[PDB]
């Protein structure tokens, strides 16, 4: 009923998205950026979407292009699946406590495209989350949310009330958006 398939081929990347708004958390993400995969898995899961993401990009340069192209594609998919946006709750919000971190997200699905990202500690402008593969620079967090809000054409406010650990700060934000989205897309019985 509320599905969307988006293919997006740029010079930097090639993306395929499959999105079902009324899913059960069946999520499979592979972008070549493992921490981004982890975040998009959290997104899909906590939003109760069925989400398949397959992305290959110029990760030798860095993750930026891949992360950004995926977010654009994902936003487009979200907007398409929403459709005319009839009979939905439209507004959604969520607080996410994650150990010492507390994040919050609020959405208006019919509201004009906008993104406000506030509260994130300053050290996230130059923090890296690194494993055995392509690393993740937390400075991209802003971009990811902006890109999604811009391409889904929704109002999205994301706040970090407080927090220390960059893994927790980042993950809390993704989960906050997921749960705000979940509430907003749900059918309204009025």
Q: Which residues bind Mn ion (CB under 5 A)?
A: 68
At 20 the three-state DSSP class reads strand
The answer for residues whose C-beta is within 8 angstroms of residue 128's C-beta and 6 or more apart is: 135, 136, 137, 138
* 107 HSE (CA, 13 A, CB side): 28
Q: Tell me if 136 is assigned to a ligand binding site.
A: no
Question: Is residue 84 part of the contact set for a second copy (CB under 8 A)?
Answer: no
Phi and psi (nearest 5°) for 6? -125, 125
Question: Is residue 44 part of the contact set for a second copy (CB under 8 A)?
Answer: no
Q: Residue 116 forms beta bridges with which residues? A: 157
Q: Tell me if 85 is assigned to a ligand binding site.
A: no
Partner in contact with 127, chosen from Mn ion, a second copy, none, beta carbon below 5 to 8 Å by kind: a second copy
How large is the C-alpha radius of gyration of the chain?
15
How many Å apart are CA 40 and CA 127, to the nearest integer?
19
Question: Is residue 116 part of the contact set for a second copy (CB under 8 A)?
Answer: yes
Give me the least distance between CB of 166 and a second copy, in Å please: 7
How many Å apart are CA 9 and CA 122, to the nearest integer?
34
Residue of 2, 18, 108, 110 that binds a second copy (CB under 8 A)? 108
Between residues 81 and 144, which has the closer beta carbon with respect to Mn ion? 144
The binding site consists of 12, 38-46, 64-68, 90, 112, 143, 167-175
Summarize as ranges the residues that interact with a second copy (CB under 8 A): 24-25, 34-35, 37-38, 48, 58-64, 72, 91, 93-100, 102, 106-108, 111-114, 116, 118, 123, 125-135, 137, 139-140, 142-143, 147, 150, 155-157, 159, 161-162, 164-167, 179, 190
């Amino acid at each position: 009923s509320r599905r969307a398939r988006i293919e997006r081929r740029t010079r930097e990347s090639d993306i395929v998205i499959e999105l079902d708004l009324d899913g059960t958390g069946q999520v499979a993400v592979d972008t070549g950026v493992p921490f981004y995969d982890h975040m998009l898995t959290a997104l899909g899961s906590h939003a109760s979407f069925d989400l398949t993401v397959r992305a290959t990009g110029d990760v030798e340069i860095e993750a930026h292009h891949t992360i950004e192209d995926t977010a654009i594609a994902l936003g487009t998919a979200l907007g398409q699946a929403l459709g005319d946006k009839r009979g939905i709750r439209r507004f959604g919000d969520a607080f996410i406590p994650m150990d010492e971190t507390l994040a919050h997200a609020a959405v208006d699905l019919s509201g004009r495209p906008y993104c406000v990202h506030t509260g994130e500690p300053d050290h996230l402008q130059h923090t890296t989350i690194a494993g055995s593969s392509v690393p993740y620079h937390t400075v991209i967090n802003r971009h990811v949310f902006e890109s999604l809000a811009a391409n889904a054409r929704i109002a999205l406010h994301v706040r970090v009330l407080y927090g220390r650990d960059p893994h927790h700060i980042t993950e809390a934000q993704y989960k906050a958006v997921a749960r705000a989205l979940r509430q907003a897309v749900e059918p309204d019985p009025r």
